[PDB]
Design a protein around this ligand. Structure first.
Ligand SMILES: [Cl-]
Ligand SMILES: [Cl-]
Length: 164
């Protein structure tokens, strides 16, 4: 298992524009297009991102290229974030992947605000951070996904994903 396979399980794959769970336009593998209620806005963003007139539809290859860019961007955002970097640097390979997932999903800013949980992770207080992370809108809105990530952090293994 790796970060790509992991996020691919969590986000899924959709070749047409769709509304993600917060009602925002998305496509591919969790690629947020716009927060804006306009389909036009989303289509526009889509064509800009792909480099062509898409008519809200992309190919698999195109999905993946966006995915690759997004993973890369998530890792780089963590490495430049003064609050995330030190946490990331203290973790083992599996748990770094769980931090990348959250960043991918909620952005650098959202994650850096989990002040208390970050500190517990940094301190390797697995069980306590897992409980702290659960006390969030994040967990209440997307519980099954949040639970897979939380377990990852808690156990440091990919058990939450083997079967999926
Ligand atoms: Cl883009
Ligand atoms: Cl969920």
């Amino acid at each position: 298992m790796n970060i790509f396979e992991m996020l691919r399980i969590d986000e899924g794959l959709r070749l047409k524009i769709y509304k993600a769970t917060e009602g925002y336009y998305t496509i591919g593998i969790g690629h947020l297009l716009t927060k804006s209620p306009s389909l036009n806005a989303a289509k526009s963003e889509l064509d800009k991102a792909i480099g062509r007139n898409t008519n809200g539809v992309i190919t698999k290859d195109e999905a993946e290229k966006l995915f690759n860019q997004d993973v890369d961007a998530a890792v780089r955002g963590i490495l430049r974030n003064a609050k995330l970097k030190p946490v990331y640097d203290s973790l083992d390979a599996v748990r770094r992947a769980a931090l990348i997932n959250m960043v991918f999903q909620m952005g650098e800013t959202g994650v850096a605000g989990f002040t208390n949980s970050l500190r517990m992770l940094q301190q390797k207080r697995w069980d306590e951070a897992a409980v702290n992370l659960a006390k969030s809108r994040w967990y209440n809105q997307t519980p099954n996904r949040a639970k897979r990530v939380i377990t990852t952090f808690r156990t440091g293994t990919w058990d939450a994903y083997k079967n999926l």
